[PDB]
Amino acid sequence: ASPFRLASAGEISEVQGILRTAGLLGPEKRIAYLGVLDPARGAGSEAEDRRFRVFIHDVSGARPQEVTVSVTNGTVISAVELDTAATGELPVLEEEFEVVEQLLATDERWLKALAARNLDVSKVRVAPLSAGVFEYAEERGRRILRGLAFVQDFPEDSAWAHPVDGLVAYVDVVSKEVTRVIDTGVFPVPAEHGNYTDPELTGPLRTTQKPISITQPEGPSFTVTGGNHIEWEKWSLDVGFDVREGVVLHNIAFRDGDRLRPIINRASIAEMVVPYGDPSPIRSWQNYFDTGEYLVGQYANSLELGCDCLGDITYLSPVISDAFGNPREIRNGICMHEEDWGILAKHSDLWSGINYTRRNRRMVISFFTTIGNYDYGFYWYLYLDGTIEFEAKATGVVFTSAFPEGGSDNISQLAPGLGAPFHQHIFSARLDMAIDGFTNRVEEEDVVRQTMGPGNERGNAFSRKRTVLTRESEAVREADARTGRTWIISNPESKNRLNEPVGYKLHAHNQPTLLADPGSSIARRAAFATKDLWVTRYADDERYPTGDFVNQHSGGAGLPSYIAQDRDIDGQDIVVWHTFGLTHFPRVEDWPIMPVDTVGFKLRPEGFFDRSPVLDVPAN
Amino acid sequence: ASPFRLASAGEISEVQGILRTAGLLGPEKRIAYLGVLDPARGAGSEAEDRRFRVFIHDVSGARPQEVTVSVTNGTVISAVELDTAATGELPVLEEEFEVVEQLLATDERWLKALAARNLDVSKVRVAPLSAGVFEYAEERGRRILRGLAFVQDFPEDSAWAHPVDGLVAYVDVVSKEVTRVIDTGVFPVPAEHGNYTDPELTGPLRTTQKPISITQPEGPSFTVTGGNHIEWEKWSLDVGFDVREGVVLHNIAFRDGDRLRPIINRASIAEMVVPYGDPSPIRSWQNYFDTGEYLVGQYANSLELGCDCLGDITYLSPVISDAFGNPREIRNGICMHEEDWGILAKHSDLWSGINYTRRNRRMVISFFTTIGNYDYGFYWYLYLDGTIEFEAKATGVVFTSAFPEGGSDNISQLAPGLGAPFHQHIFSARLDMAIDGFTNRVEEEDVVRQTMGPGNERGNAFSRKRTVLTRESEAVREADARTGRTWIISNPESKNRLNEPVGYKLHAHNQPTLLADPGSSIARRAAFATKDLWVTRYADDERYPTGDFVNQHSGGAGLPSYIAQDRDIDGQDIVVWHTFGLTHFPRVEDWPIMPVDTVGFKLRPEGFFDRSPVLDVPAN
Ligand SMILES: [Cu+2]
Ligand SMILES: [Cu+2]
Ligand code: NA
Numbered sequence A, B: 001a002s003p004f005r006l007a008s009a010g011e012i013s014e015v016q017g018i019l020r021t022a023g024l025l026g027p028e029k030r031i032a033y034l035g036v037l038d039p040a041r042g043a044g045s046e047a048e049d050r051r052f053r054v055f056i057h058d059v060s061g062a063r064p065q066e067v068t069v070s071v072t073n074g075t076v077i078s079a080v081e082l083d084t085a086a087t088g089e090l091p092v093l094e095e096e097f098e099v100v101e102q103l104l105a106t107d108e109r110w111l112k113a114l115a116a117r118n119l120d121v122s123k124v125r126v127a128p129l130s131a132g133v134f135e136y137a138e139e140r141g142r143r144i145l146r147g148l149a150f151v152q153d154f155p156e157d158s159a160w161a162h163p164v165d166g167l168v169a170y171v172d173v174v175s176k177e178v179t180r181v182i183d184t185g186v187f188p189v190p191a192e193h194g195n196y197t198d199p200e201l202t203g204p205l206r207t208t209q210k211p212i213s214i215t216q217p218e219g220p221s222f223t224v225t226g227g228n229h230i231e232w233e234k235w236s237l238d239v240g241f242d243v244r245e246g247v248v249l250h251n252i253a254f255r256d257g258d259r260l261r262p263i264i265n266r267a268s269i270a271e272m273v274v275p276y277g278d279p280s281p282i283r284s285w286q287n288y289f290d291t292g293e294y295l296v297g298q299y300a301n302s303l304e305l306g307c308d309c310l311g312d313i314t315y316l317s318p319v320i321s322d323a324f325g326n327p328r329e330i331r332n333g334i335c336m337h338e339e340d341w342g343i344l345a346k347h348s349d350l351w352s353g354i355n356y357t358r359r360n361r362r363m364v365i366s367f368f369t370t371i372g373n374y375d376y377g378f379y380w381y382l383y384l385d386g387t388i389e390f391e392a393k394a395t396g397v398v399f400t401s402a403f404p405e406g407g408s409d410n411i412s413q414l415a416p417g418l419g420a421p422f423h424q425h426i427f428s429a430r431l432d433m434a435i436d437g438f439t440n441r442v443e444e445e446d447v448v449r450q451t452m453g454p455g456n457e458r459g460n461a462f463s464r465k466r467t468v469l470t471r472e473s474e475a476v477r478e479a480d481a482r483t484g485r486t487w488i489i490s491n492p493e494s495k496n497r498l499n500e501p502v503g504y505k506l507h508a509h510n511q512p513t514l515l516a517d518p519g520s521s522i523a524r525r526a527a528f529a530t531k532d533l534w535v536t537r538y539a540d541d542e543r544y545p546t547g548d549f550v551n552q553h554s555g556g557a558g559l560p561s562y563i564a565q566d567r568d569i570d571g572q573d574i575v576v577w578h579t580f581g582l583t584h585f586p587r588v589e590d591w592p593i594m595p596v597d598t599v600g601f602k603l604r605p606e607g608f609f610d611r612s613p614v615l616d617v618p619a620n
């Protein structure tokens, strides 16, 4: 009955049937995106309407379409032809990846470049990468992928150990033509293998690790109802899944006494960009928008018990659409479980004689995705004390190149002749806030240092200041770790028992933001990533910080266009967009497979409750 | 046989006997500090000499002494009379705490101040706090504690809920005289109780938490030999315990192939300061040096199974000296166990068909201490991939005051009439480095942004720069989160297989440092806390960033005096001192007992290994 339930296989099948009967899903059509739409603001009517948004690609060259369908009514609500030179190309299709390697395999320029290097074409894998927007006027309005080559010595070989530097090709994947092959010179293909399951590389495996057994003899403390509704330790939420964004959290609320108090209306990772910092023309165009260009949800892994998720695990298995509109289940694609989290609160009081210790725990909701060489884990945490935390886990195999003779200012050496270009992994969290309801505001909180003098005779005082952001034009903020800068989202019309507005405090990790020159293509396409915090007024169609169509889209759309409306955000329905990321200078220890590195953020209650919300936790 | 073994009850008893027979431990003497000395540099002779350092207080007013004793020989090696007006007073004695309240209970000025407020003296608890150095010339050379009052309504009442503001007393604890009683005006004593085990405050306890069972059916993966030597997953170390510093880690090394490779020679939290930022004269003098003035090790808790430490726990029970030289065991004062730590490395490769997942774990070594209202957990972590991490956990009851009518810029309101002054908790980690041996250096690594132009035509390149710190005068560094600043400790005479110096990278949390005016007493006594990173040349007697005698010591000693020697630190035996802390603006949720907040730092391998050190971890 819940409007926020996961899409069903039956719904996707109805969507396929509605599109087909409407004439919109002929043999030359492909579904490049399909997803359920959230209910619009003011849905207390119970007049539910399950609608899906669909991007339809055409492999013959005809214009793609954006289509909105009502499953509940069985109708096409709207269908628009897209001018992709203007508004951007559709996301990359899984079936287009293999096209690149097949097309290059019969191109005379490509074969000529491989012959010069004595490489067997049957052993050359091509990584199909998004193209971006640069100086090539012939690419505008076409679907281009760019290809970089790696040698696979045998079927189970790790091709990433053998990059073919100095060589790159551009491919029009609709007309099936290789537009350019650029060969800047022969580099030795690095010879060492990177096969991390080869006994001659690992050595004898350890026999020293004794097992750790985590079990829940009475089952877990959370309940799942209606497929995706979670209740756990006073928290209430709905777990969504979208093929672009992945896990989306809806209706995050906390049961305080007998009031269910809203906190966050929708939480998601709405974009992630991976810009590379190597100025070689072979790679200087390389920027992955994993969310916007590739859709991270469609490459979610099936998570294995005892390996990927340890403990008493509850799985969700979301359903997505394939390119033809058939439903596809991602078996065990979301893990949910609770974890012990050490000490929650502890005091031994000399005067009262009372010794008191309570333990903390957290609820974990996670999925893992694989895009080529990269693997990313997305983790959402709910803590007993009201803290909400997001953590991204980055692993997989680093993207490689040749390491040039004479070194490099922009590439790390991993092995003889093998390099790893510098890069960043930058995320955008979109937090549609609802602190005790939808009337919210954001204040920026800085520590304030005070000068020794009258009123501060011993020079020990320090304070803080809070600045309300009142309009979108002043709501583009940067971090300042040195002044302990945080941001507070409050409800000015909801007060705690001390008559202070209730709030939550966002704590950032204060990592560097986008490093590229401000005049670069990537700085214009990934403008969100140049600033730590953006606050917009809620609008139905303002979903992604990069806009709806990121692939080969020139720039401007997304957050810079939204904030130019300069809307009132002081006690209004607002959306916080937080940029955070890792700057990766690869180390020898990252090779041949990288140990996990992490980045994230958290929100903690700030006078939201009238006292500690965990006084009723028992000793156990 | 190991020179780094824990002190035994037998050793402390021998120390007591040696002091007594030497005439240095008469009835008027008290031991204010006793601890084993580390072996000096170059101890390959096997000529072990177990020596103890002792601070001896005299309750009759005679000069205290510093004494060094050889247990192995049974001799007094040296004994020096201390001039405390010059070099500082001895640490506060546990027996001096109760003296403050007893003395004030018969002082006419104190009783007069309590009578004006209608407070029964039998119900008034006095927090005995360290005095620092301010404007009172009569305090120089005397042992002063300052007292702040709280009302306990009944024996099991939390006195912290009832501060008596506007009132403070100073007490000479050797002459047993109240030097000053300052009454600045009557504030209402806050009436609400803060009794977090009272059912009328907690409400009915939760019945929703199902148990989490963590067990190790084959026992733990680490071994303990010689009382305190740990071997675990290629790590090797010795766990020390000192009454001042607490847990100290010795000889941290990693088994790489068949080489035992040193990393850190000694790791400890060598000071921690808690400065308060309220300019009221009642509290503007308030600064706790928990390590230097109080000795955090002597107030270590006994940790309970299933509550404080969960899982398959191995305990150490360190022995310390009481004030008379009798040995005292801190039963179960150190917890040691291993914890699952999620995914270590994961990749699903399309081209090779190989799916690979390995899990991480960490070794945990921890203790908890209680100083008055405060409780602190100290946690050291060793990870499979070579990462070392420290985490401090802050909980307990916030220090309280009245909340003034008309508000405050320096105090938070927690409850009707109840305030919590702003403050910081700042730690100093002393890392005696030994990266592949003792020839080390420190480089500061900043991200470098590059301008679009020739050689960087697309404006995407970025780089990094490393600056070697060559002499102590240039080795006082500050954080720069915006430029991703880290510090690398390398060995320039030990290279990895790519012929790069091996190293470890220190990652700071980049929290604010000391906020007090630079001209303040606390900024001069806690100079270490004004800067994020200091590097000194190793010296036997340079143990603490604040010097040996912190209590009532005027300033200068410690790190500013050490670095004025301007010694060579470029490929030498060096010590890294890292400052890190929490700036605490108390929130309503911190009352009546505070949920844990955390701060720390970590060190990760940076080309220390020739590839990932965790390829030989099995799938399990
Ligand atoms: Cu990376
Ligand atoms: Cu605090
Ligand atoms: Na355009």
Ligand code: NA
Pocket (backbone or CB within 6 Å): A265, A432, A433, A434, A438, A538, A572, A573, A574, A575
């Ligand atoms: Na909102």
Ligand code: NA
Pocket (backbone or CB within 6 Å): B085, B086, B087, B088, B553, B554, B555
């Ligand atoms: Na002095």
Ligand code: NA
Pocket (backbone or CB within 6 Å): B265, B432, B433, B434, B438, B538, B572, B573, B574, B575
């Ligand atoms: Na050293």
